[PDB]
Design a protein around this ligand. Structure first.
Ligand code: GDP
Ligand code: MG
Length: 166
Protein backbone atom coordinates (compact mmCIF):
# COMPACT_ATOMS: atom_id res chain seq x y z
CA UNK A 1 0.00 0.00 0.00
CA UNK A 2 1.45 3.41 -0.96
CA UNK A 3 1.97 5.99 1.82
CA UNK A 4 2.19 9.81 1.62
CA UNK A 5 2.81 12.35 4.42
CA UNK A 6 0.54 15.38 5.01
CA UNK A 7 2.67 18.10 6.64
CA UNK A 8 -0.16 20.18 8.18
CA UNK A 9 0.68 23.77 9.20
CA UNK A 10 -1.30 26.96 9.95
CA UNK A 11 -2.26 28.78 13.16
CA UNK A 12 -3.63 27.97 16.65
CA UNK A 13 -7.22 28.77 15.61
CA UNK A 14 -7.74 27.87 11.93
CA UNK A 15 -9.38 24.43 12.32
CA UNK A 16 -6.49 22.20 11.14
CA UNK A 17 -7.00 19.76 14.05
CA UNK A 18 -10.83 19.50 13.89
CA UNK A 19 -10.28 18.88 10.16
CA UNK A 20 -7.93 15.95 10.85
CA UNK A 21 -9.83 14.24 13.75
CA UNK A 22 -13.12 14.89 11.90
CA UNK A 23 -11.83 12.87 8.90
CA UNK A 24 -11.12 10.03 11.37
CA UNK A 25 -13.57 10.05 14.36
CA UNK A 26 -15.87 12.62 12.64
CA UNK A 27 -17.19 14.40 15.78
CA UNK A 28 -15.97 18.05 15.39
CA UNK A 29 -13.78 18.63 18.48
CA UNK A 30 -14.92 21.80 20.30
CA UNK A 31 -12.19 21.77 22.99
CA UNK A 32 -8.98 20.11 21.71
CA UNK A 33 -5.85 21.07 23.70
CA UNK A 34 -3.30 22.49 21.19
CA UNK A 35 -0.53 21.25 23.56
CA UNK A 36 -0.74 17.62 22.32
CA UNK A 37 1.52 15.96 19.71
CA UNK A 38 0.55 12.83 17.73
CA UNK A 39 0.18 11.41 14.19
CA UNK A 40 -3.32 10.70 12.82
CA UNK A 41 -3.51 8.15 9.96
CA UNK A 42 -6.25 6.98 7.59
CA UNK A 43 -6.66 4.04 5.16
CA UNK A 44 -9.26 5.33 2.68
CA UNK A 45 -9.14 4.94 -1.12
CA UNK A 46 -8.62 7.75 -3.68
CA UNK A 47 -10.27 6.31 -6.82
CA UNK A 48 -9.60 2.54 -6.78
CA UNK A 49 -6.21 2.36 -5.01
CA UNK A 50 -5.89 2.56 -1.20
CA UNK A 51 -3.22 4.81 0.37
CA UNK A 52 -2.28 5.35 4.04
CA UNK A 53 -1.72 9.02 4.99
CA UNK A 54 0.47 9.99 7.98
CA UNK A 55 -1.07 13.41 8.78
CA UNK A 56 0.94 15.45 11.31
CA UNK A 57 -0.88 18.33 13.07
CA UNK A 58 2.42 19.48 14.69
CA UNK A 59 1.43 21.35 17.88
CA UNK A 60 4.46 22.20 20.07
CA UNK A 61 5.76 20.76 23.38
CA UNK A 62 7.27 23.74 25.25
CA UNK A 63 10.33 25.52 23.80
CA UNK A 64 13.14 23.57 22.06
CA UNK A 65 10.90 21.02 20.25
CA UNK A 66 13.19 20.54 17.18
CA UNK A 67 10.60 18.16 15.67
CA UNK A 68 8.58 20.43 13.35
CA UNK A 69 11.75 21.37 11.40
CA UNK A 70 12.68 17.70 10.81
CA UNK A 71 9.08 17.10 9.61
CA UNK A 72 9.18 19.90 6.99
CA UNK A 73 11.89 17.79 5.30
CA UNK A 74 10.14 14.38 5.80
CA UNK A 75 6.50 14.95 4.71
CA UNK A 76 5.65 16.64 1.38
CA UNK A 77 1.88 17.42 1.50
CA UNK A 78 1.80 20.95 2.93
CA UNK A 79 -1.85 21.53 3.86
CA UNK A 80 -1.39 25.10 5.13
CA UNK A 81 -4.81 25.64 6.79
CA UNK A 82 -5.73 29.34 6.54
CA UNK A 83 -8.84 30.50 8.44
CA UNK A 84 -10.45 33.20 6.27
CA UNK A 85 -12.52 34.41 9.27
CA UNK A 86 -9.38 35.13 11.33
CA UNK A 87 -7.08 37.22 9.05
CA UNK A 88 -4.04 36.65 11.32
CA UNK A 89 -3.85 33.10 9.93
CA UNK A 90 -3.39 34.64 6.46
CA UNK A 91 -0.34 36.64 7.61
CA UNK A 92 0.90 33.34 9.11
CA UNK A 93 0.81 31.71 5.64
CA UNK A 94 3.13 34.51 4.44
CA UNK A 95 6.21 33.55 6.54
CA UNK A 96 5.07 29.88 6.53
CA UNK A 97 6.12 29.80 2.84
CA UNK A 98 9.75 30.51 3.80
CA UNK A 99 10.44 27.91 6.46
CA UNK A 100 9.08 25.09 4.28
CA UNK A 101 11.16 26.56 1.47
CA UNK A 102 14.05 26.62 3.99
CA UNK A 103 14.00 22.91 4.76
CA UNK A 104 13.64 21.67 1.16
CA UNK A 105 15.77 24.76 0.21
CA UNK A 106 14.49 24.30 -3.38
CA UNK A 107 11.17 26.23 -3.70
CA UNK A 108 9.45 23.15 -5.22
CA UNK A 109 7.09 21.59 -2.66
CA UNK A 110 3.60 20.21 -3.36
CA UNK A 111 2.15 23.22 -1.52
CA UNK A 112 -1.61 23.72 -0.92
CA UNK A 113 -3.18 26.83 0.68
CA UNK A 114 -6.57 25.90 2.15
CA UNK A 115 -9.24 28.31 3.49
CA UNK A 116 -10.76 26.83 6.67
CA UNK A 117 -13.79 28.48 8.35
CA UNK A 118 -15.67 29.02 5.05
CA UNK A 119 -19.02 27.92 6.61
CA UNK A 120 -20.27 31.45 7.44
CA UNK A 121 -21.10 34.84 5.87
CA UNK A 122 -18.57 36.85 7.94
CA UNK A 123 -15.75 36.79 5.36
CA UNK A 124 -12.90 39.03 6.60
CA UNK A 125 -10.71 37.72 3.74
CA UNK A 126 -12.22 38.27 0.26
CA UNK A 127 -11.96 35.42 -2.28
CA UNK A 128 -9.79 37.49 -4.65
CA UNK A 129 -6.63 38.65 -2.85
CA UNK A 130 -6.30 35.08 -1.55
CA UNK A 131 -6.38 33.81 -5.15
CA UNK A 132 -3.34 36.02 -5.84
CA UNK A 133 -1.47 34.69 -2.77
CA UNK A 134 -1.71 31.03 -3.84
CA UNK A 135 -1.36 31.66 -7.61
CA UNK A 136 1.86 33.51 -6.70
CA UNK A 137 3.60 30.27 -5.63
CA UNK A 138 1.68 28.26 -8.30
CA UNK A 139 -0.48 26.45 -5.71
CA UNK A 140 -4.23 25.64 -5.56
CA UNK A 141 -6.54 27.64 -3.24
CA UNK A 142 -9.39 25.83 -1.43
CA UNK A 143 -11.88 26.51 1.41
CA UNK A 144 -12.84 23.85 3.99
CA UNK A 145 -14.74 23.75 7.30
CA UNK A 146 -14.27 21.11 10.03
CA UNK A 147 -17.71 22.07 11.44
CA UNK A 148 -19.53 20.32 8.54
CA UNK A 149 -17.06 18.15 6.49
CA UNK A 150 -17.36 20.78 3.72
CA UNK A 151 -14.22 21.18 1.56
CA UNK A 152 -12.23 18.68 3.70
CA UNK A 153 -12.42 16.32 0.68
CA UNK A 154 -11.19 18.92 -1.84
CA UNK A 155 -8.15 19.59 0.42
CA UNK A 156 -6.83 16.07 1.19
CA UNK A 157 -7.66 15.11 -2.43
CA UNK A 158 -5.76 17.96 -4.14
CA UNK A 159 -2.79 17.05 -1.89
CA UNK A 160 -2.52 13.37 -2.92
CA UNK A 161 -2.98 14.41 -6.59
CA UNK A 162 -0.18 17.02 -6.59
CA UNK A 163 2.22 14.59 -4.86
CA UNK A 164 1.28 11.93 -7.46
CA UNK A 165 2.83 14.13 -10.17
CA UNK A 166 5.48 16.28 -8.41
N1 GDP B 1 -17.47 27.31 12.78
C1 GDP B 1 -16.31 26.68 12.71
N2 GDP B 1 -15.45 26.71 13.74
C2 GDP B 1 -14.32 26.01 13.48
C3 GDP B 1 -13.99 25.31 12.32
N3 GDP B 1 -12.72 24.72 12.44
C4 GDP B 1 -12.40 25.10 13.62
N4 GDP B 1 -13.25 25.86 14.34
C5 GDP B 1 -13.10 26.41 15.70
O1 GDP B 1 -11.86 27.15 15.82
C6 GDP B 1 -11.10 26.66 16.94
C7 GDP B 1 -9.69 26.27 16.50
O2 GDP B 1 -9.62 24.91 16.03
P1 GDP B 1 -8.67 23.84 16.77
O3 GDP B 1 -8.59 22.63 15.92
O4 GDP B 1 -9.10 23.73 18.18
O5 GDP B 1 -7.23 24.57 16.74
P2 GDP B 1 -6.29 24.46 15.44
O6 GDP B 1 -5.20 23.55 15.86
O7 GDP B 1 -5.85 25.85 15.19
O8 GDP B 1 -7.18 23.91 14.40
C8 GDP B 1 -11.84 25.47 17.55
O9 GDP B 1 -12.15 25.72 18.92
C9 GDP B 1 -13.10 25.30 16.73
O10 GDP B 1 -14.26 25.38 17.57
C10 GDP B 1 -14.91 25.28 11.24
O11 GDP B 1 -14.79 24.73 10.15
N5 GDP B 1 -16.06 26.00 11.53
MG1 MG C 1 -4.39 21.85 17.46
Amino acid sequence: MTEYKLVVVGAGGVGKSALTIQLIQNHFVDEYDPTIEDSYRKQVVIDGETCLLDILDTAGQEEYSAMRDQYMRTGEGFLCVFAINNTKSFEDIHQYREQIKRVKDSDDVPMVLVGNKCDLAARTVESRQAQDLARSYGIPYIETSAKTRQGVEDAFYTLVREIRQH
